């Protein structure tokens, strides 16, 4: 996408009723990190799902240490919060022209 949303006001794209393809997001080497919590990161293909929420924003680069669920931090207690029993994947990659 051209422009994203802020960490202040973020964007929620509800995704249903389509055939996913996570492997093409997996094998493509354009990512700084790929951390799937609760689900094994290469087993994304075999489990079939109810609802998908695509949540995109931007952040200070050291605050990917604070994007983890349960981890405290000034983004975590003020701006964007995950539950302790969160499952899913957070993906972050660098943005120097993006």
């Amino acid at each position: 996408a051209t422009r994203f949303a802020s960490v202040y006001a973020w964007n929620r794209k509800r995704i249903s009723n389509c055939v996913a393809d996570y492997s093409v997001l997996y094998n493509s080497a354009s990512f700084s990190t790929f951390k799937c919590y609760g689900v094994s990161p290469t087993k994304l293909n075999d489990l079939c799902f109810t609802n998908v929420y695509a949540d995109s924003f931007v952040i200070r680069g050291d605050e990917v240490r604070q994007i983890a669920p349960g981890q405290t931090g000034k983004i975590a207690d003020y701006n964007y919060k995950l539950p302790d029993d969160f499952t899913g994947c957070v993906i972050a990659w660098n943005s120097n022209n993006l």
Partner: protein, 49 residues
């Protein structure tokens, strides 16, 4: 098994093992004591017979 690789699936499973095994061992102990009681009753019944 359908959602994790080895090193963490083993952990979660191990959490299940210590506790399903505990349940089984509790059941065994209860049944053993109950059986000993039943034995006492049976020896009494044989004595009466």
């Amino acid at each position: 098994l359908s959602r994790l690789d080895k090193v963490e699936a083993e952990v979660q499973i191990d959490r299940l093992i210590t506790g399903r095994l505990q349940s089984l061992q509790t059941y065994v102990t209860q049944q053993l004591i109950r059986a000993a009681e039943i034995r006492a009753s049976a020896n009494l019944a044989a004595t009466k017979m």
